[PDB]
Amino acid sequence: VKIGMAIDDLRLERWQKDRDIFVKKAESLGAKVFVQSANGNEETQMSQIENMINRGVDVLVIIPYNGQVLSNVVKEAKQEGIKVLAYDRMINDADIDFYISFDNEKVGELQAKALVDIVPQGNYFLMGGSPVDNNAKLFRAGQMKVLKPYVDSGKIKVVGDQWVDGWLPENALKIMENALTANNNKIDAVVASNDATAGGAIQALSAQGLSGKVAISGQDADLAGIKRIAAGTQTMTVYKPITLLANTAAEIAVELGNGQEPKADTTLNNGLKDVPSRLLTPIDVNKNNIKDTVIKDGFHKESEL
Numbered sequence: 001v002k003i004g005m006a007i008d009d010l011r012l013e014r015w016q017k018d019r020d021i022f023v024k025k026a027e028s029l030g031a032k033v034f035v036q037s038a039n040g041n042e043e044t045q046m047s048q049i050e051n052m053i054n055r056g057v058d059v060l061v062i063i064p065y066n067g068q069v070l071s072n073v074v075k076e077a078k079q080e081g082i083k084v085l086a087y088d089r090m091i092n093d094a095d096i097d098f099y100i101s102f103d104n105e106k107v108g109e110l111q112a113k114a115l116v117d118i119v120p121q122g123n124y125f126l127m128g129g130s131p132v133d134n135n136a137k138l139f140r141a142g143q144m145k146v147l148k149p150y151v152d153s154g155k156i157k158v159v160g161d162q163w164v165d166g167w168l169p170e171n172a173l174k175i176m177e178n179a180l181t182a183n184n185n186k187i188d189a190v191v192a193s194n195d196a197t198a199g200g201a202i203q204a205l206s207a208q209g210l211s212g213k214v215a216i217s218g219q220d221a222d223l224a225g226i227k228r229i230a231a232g233t234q235t236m237t238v239y240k241p242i243t244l245l246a247n248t249a250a251e252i253a254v255e256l257g258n259g260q261e262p263k264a265d266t267t268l269n270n271g272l273k274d275v276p277s278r279l280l281t282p283i284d285v286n287k288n289n290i291k292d293t294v295i296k297d298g299f300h301k302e303s304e305l
Contacts, residue, residue, distance in 0.1 A: 001031040001059065001257030004052030005087075008045055008065030010037030015063060018087070021246035022061070022253075029254040042066050049073050058257045059083045061249065067091040071272075083256035087249055092270045097256060099268060100249045102240045103279035104135055108142020108193070110284045111217035114236040115189045116150055119215045122188030123159045125179050127172060127201060129193040131163035139193045139219070147191075159183050164193075169200035176204035189215040195225030195237050202233055221285055221294050223304060229287055230305065239283040239293055248278060 003026055007015050019035060026033045034055065038045035042065050052060055053076060060082055064070060067090055074084055074094040084096040091099075115124070124147070129136030150156035160179045164172045172192070179187060185208055192198035198218040205211045211233045218225050218237035228234035255262040264276035285293050294300050 001029075001254050002055075002057045003031050003033045003059045003061060003253050003257065004049075004055065004057035005033060005035045005061040005063075006045055006048045006052060007035065007037045007063045008089075009040035011039050017242045018063075018246045018249075021243055022250050025247045025250040026253060029250065031254055031257065038065055040065060042069060046070075046073060049077070053077050053080060053082060057082060059085065059253045061085045061087050061253055062091065063087045064089050064091050068093065070094050085249070085253055085256060086275070088245065090268065090270055090275070093272045094270065095272065096270070096275055098252055098262065098264075099270075099275045099277040100245065100252060101277070101279055102245065102282050103265070104138035105142035105145070106279070107219055107238050107240075107282045108139040108144075109146050110142075110238050110282060111139070111193070111219065111236070112143040112146035112191055114284060114286065115191060115215045115217055116146060116156070118235070119189045120150070121155045123157050123183065123186055125159055125176075125183075125187050125190045126161040127175060127190055127192040127197060128161070128163035129167050129197065130165060133167075136163065136193060143191050143193075159187060164197045167194060167197060169196045172197035172200035173204050176201035177207075180204060180208055180210075185210060187214060190217070192217050194219040195222040195234075196220070198234055198237075199224055199228070202228060206233070221299060223300055226285070226290060226294060226300060227305065229285065230290060232287070236284060236286040239285045239299070240280075241283065241297055241299070243297065244280055248280065252278065 023033050036048040071094045078095050086096050086099040162175045195218040215235045221237045221239040225237045252262045265279045267274040268277045
């Protein structure tokens with residue numbers, strides 16, 4: 001099986017790990033893998049995807065820089081018998097065959113559940129990600145799925161709700177201060193949607209003497225986040241292991257290559273058809289399993305703590 005992997009931007013860290021694990025596990029299953037990176041350019045990617053079509057690849061694995069502008073090239077690909085897998089980011093209005101990601105709703109669920117676990121009753125503030133990010137909305141859907149019975153029953157009172165423009169920690173800091181002020185510091189838990197915005201909120205909390213006293217959620221397992229968790233100022237974070245994503249992506253790719261039908265958790269609709277999807281299960285990281293998750297994995301080294 002020949003695989004063409006067209007990564008939107010390798011000039012950063014975000015995908016260099018996905019690439020190697022994917023490769024090694026792909027070859028391991030007996031396939032050739034050709035990789036190109038678009039250096040964050042939409043037109044380099046088009047060029048590259050086309051290059052892979054013209055090389056006679058059996059499977060295209062695309063991480064789209066922009067997944068709205070790929071309908072014609074994907075169609076072109078299907079006309080040649082090539083299978084298309086959307087890696088991590090959905091390709092919209094296109095005739096793709098499969099999509100692999102972490103389950104973002106479950107990310108939101110883990111966030112809210114770790115919080116109701118220690119603060120079952122009290123005042124909650126909701127801190128979304130970018131209000132124009134659909135992932136932000138998926139995290140919020142999972143959060144509210146957990147909170148709903150607590151809210152409807154009066155056990156939890158939502159005292160604020162804001163979306164952090166651009167996921168900027170400085171925006172989150174100002175949102176937190178605003179919230180604390182409007183509530184006279186009476187806030188028991190902050191459902192923050194990532195480690196970076198949580199960090200900013202935590203600075204506002206610290207400045208009021210409230211750090212370690214207010215439950216707060218996160219995501220990504222940033223080093224700074226991991227430390228806060230160890231120190232007691234952050235409650236938890238959500239870890240999304242690259243190995244798991246990249247390995248499963250390779251197994252799906254080979255599968256697609258051998259004309260097989262890989263097992264899907266669900267079906268997401270991209271505005272053309274329903275795309276079979278594996279939405280991996282994200283990992284709850286708290287003070288008691290930091291070593292058995294993010295250290296054990298090599299995501300962070302013990303000596304960094």
